[PDB]
Design a binder for this molecule. Structure first.
Ligand SMILES: Cc1ncc(COP(=O)(O)O)c(/C=N/[C@@H]2[C@@H](O)[C@@H](OP(=O)(O)OP(=O)(O)OC[C@H]3O[C@@H](n4cc(C)c(=O)[nH]c4=O)C[C@@H]3O)O[C@H](C)[C@H]2O)c1O
Ligand SMILES: Cc1ncc(COP(=O)(O)O)c(/C=N/[C@@H]2[C@@H](O)[C@@H](OP(=O)(O)OP(=O)(O)OC[C@H]3O[C@@H](n4cc(C)c(=O)[nH]c4=O)C[C@@H]3O)O[C@H](C)[C@H]2O)c1O
Ligand SMILES: [Cl-]
Ligand SMILES: [Cl-]
Ligand SMILES: [Mg+2]
Lengths: 362, 362
């Protein structure tokens, strides 16, 4: 069976270094809010070329912190892509604000910036751009509209660690970037973890306070806070893995290159980034009309696949109130997408096998 | 320097077992939602004598999950002790509900059940009882009022793992129990972690869903959820430490016994539990009129102390709107309390040293 994502094999490359990093935390007797978090924040900010980074508990919490720290009026709207993973939208709902869905461009699977303005109202306060599947959103028209309406740009970078647009890294393309370090991400922990990136020192400080019960000074609570911290053990593992992130992303890109050049099936639509540095290939997403039949065929041929995603947020029981809204581009994507195996440790001869098996489906 | 709480020394007792447990998780390649969480939940439910336990990210999240899962009307009130750690109150605020503060009994530092009814309204939906410092709340009058008004009882058990009232463990004294496993707690992880305990299978299932983005079935979201999980590494460490929790609590109780029998200073008020099994001695809290002078004297004598707590929630900037409300019993406690060193690994001869140093303060 070709595995979709072999996390044991990804992390086995660092077995001795992970052991030493965990043992350093255990021997420090400091498990939270410590030197490994400080070093990881400094190094991840440097990687994104932001002045600041603040660790937190997971990627949804990163988004919740970014929105909550703005303290927008309770009737505020936040624009968000209709086809993202449900967590990008949950963050807005969980802050008590109104998500306003905008279709992706079918060509990019990312928010269509030329559809946003039609949904801006006097209540709009922010845009959550999602760099979906590893592709950076083309930001030029988002920058224009954000400034025209004095909106904040909140990047959901959970799937796109290291992606580039106009020479800037995701996490440095708006007011604040929000990251997941869930174990399956392009930079994965061995547990839940997240961070924000920003150049705004006052927002970095406010988020660091809110994520620690609202406290920067022992015994004192400035804000009504949350509890959203990155464990020292996980910061230590992330800091050692960060050194290899560009190389891992390049390894992914070489699998994507095999698929993009060797799949020749007119009934399968391949991902096509606008620039190679814009895509770090968290997910390699194809579209086909017979998606469930293709997944079963591939399974019979020894190839594990997952769907990102089969049910869009507005069709979930969670968003029952939206189930009769029409987002036909999003609906089509969710009926047609399948994710092919891709990772930094995947053998290239498996990608050639998969490409020819896909060509035999036609 | 006698340390307040030596976590390295607490965890050093389990050095080889923690190494083996972490390595089992790493070699499984399953870091979340796995066998260590299943085993820990089963064993912690058995320990509390509840049918169910659901792991989550931390103790505040445990409380947030318990309240959120009830889906109370948005104008609802929740009764909570005025003198608890601020997180018990943050959980209510963060769910968009109205905290209604009730004074503790000065004799117990726990909610005065004979002051609750005066603050019940038609909007009251629950009581958050807090087993503060390790002492179980006397529940008989809380049970009576909860049933009279059809209120839910949500136990904040963060400080009281293993405490007993009327032969039942904290976490089995209401509708749902909420636990912290923050590293300093009587059962501590090596990172953030938490759980709920309950006999209600439908609430356990709903909380497990909400804590995993609202999803029990892959690709499907029943509820608008959060991301609040217990890492497999932390569940593994908690499960091995749970075997020693009663023995660690008894070791704490023996330090408390030294303080309670050997401090003879009429200007210092000692903690006095109603039954020995009701107190697991997370914190050993004294009161004195010259609290800041006593803390500095003890520091000069080589004894580290902390304050639980010096600023009550209603006086915090976080709750600025409450800063002119009067809770004189809570205010007095916060001006007078100091916590003496106590832990399962503290040397008993240090407790005798501390007791005689306190007697020399008079
Ligand atoms: C745009 C966007 N925004 C915010 C978020 C929220 O970030 P978070 O709060 O940090 O999760 C996400 C998360 N997004 C991801 C989402 O895309 C989805 O990802 P998925 O690929 O379907 O997830 P997975 O199935 O758990 O992992 C994939 C492979 O990995 C293997 N695996 C996994 C684990 C955990 C393991 O322990 N061992 C394994 O071997 C099993 C699978 O084959 O579901 C996850 C729970 C979310 O974190 C997002 O995409
Ligand atoms: C009633 C109630 N409800 C809900 C909650 C919320 O639970 P949570 O969300 O899980 O935190 C609490 C938490 N309550 C505690 C609260 O009592 C307070 O506890 P504290 O004793 O003042 O905390 P501490 O100073 O961090 O730890 C004490 C000693 O431990 C040493 N230490 C600590 C750490 C973390 C370390 O890594 N290494 C060390 O050596 C240093 C100190 O000397 O602050 C904590 C952050 C909360 O988690 C509560 O009391
Ligand atoms: Cl649209
Ligand atoms: Cl009162
Ligand atoms: Mg965590």
């Amino acid at each position: 069976m070709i595995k979709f994502l072999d996390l044991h094999k990804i992390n086995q490359r660092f077995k001795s270094e992970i052991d030493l990093a965990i043992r350093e935390v255990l021997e420090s007797g400091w498990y939270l809010l410590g030197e490994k978090n400080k070093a990881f924040e400094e190094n991840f900010a440097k990687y994104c070329e932001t002045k600041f980074s603040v660790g937190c508990a997971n990627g949804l919490d990163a988004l919740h912190l970014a929105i909550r720290a703005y303290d927008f009026p309770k009737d505020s709207e936040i624009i968000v892509p209709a086809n993202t993973y449900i967590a990008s939208i949950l963050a807005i709902s969980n802050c008590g604000l109104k998500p306003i869905l905008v279709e992706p461009n079918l060509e990019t699977y990312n928010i269509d910036a030329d559809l946003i303005e039609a949904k801006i109202t006097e209540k709009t306060k922010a845009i959550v751009v999602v760099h979906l599947y590893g592709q950076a959103v083309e930001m030029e028209k988002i920058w224009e509209l954000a400034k025209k309406y004095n909106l904040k740009i909140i990047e959901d970078c959970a799937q796109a660690h290291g992606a580039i647009y106009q020479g800037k890294k995701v996490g440095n393309l708006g007011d604040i970037g929000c990251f997941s370090f869930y174990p399956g991400k392009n930079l994965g922990a061995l547990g839940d973890g997240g961070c924000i990136t920003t150049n705004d020192e006052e927002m970095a400080t406010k988020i660091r306070a809110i994520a620690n019960y609202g406290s920067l000074i022992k015994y004192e609570n400035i804000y009504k806070g949350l509890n959203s911290r990155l464990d020292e053990i996980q910061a230590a593992i992330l800091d050692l893995k960060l050194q290899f992130l560009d190389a891992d992303n390049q390894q992914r890109r070489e699998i994507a290159k095999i698929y993009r050049e060797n799949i020749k099936n007119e009934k399968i639509i391949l991902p096509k980034p606008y620039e190679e540095e814009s895509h770090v290939w968290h997910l390699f997403v194809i579209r086909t009309k017979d998606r469930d039949k293709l997944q079963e065929y591939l399974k019979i041929k020894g190839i594990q696949t997952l769907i990102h995603y089969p049910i869009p947020p507005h069709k979930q029981n969670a968003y029952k109130e939206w189930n009769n809204l029409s987002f036909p581009i999003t609906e089509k994507i969710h009926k047609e997408v399948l994710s092919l195996p891709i990772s930094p440790v995947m053998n290239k001869e498996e990608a050639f096998y998969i490409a020819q098996i896909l060509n035999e489906f036609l």
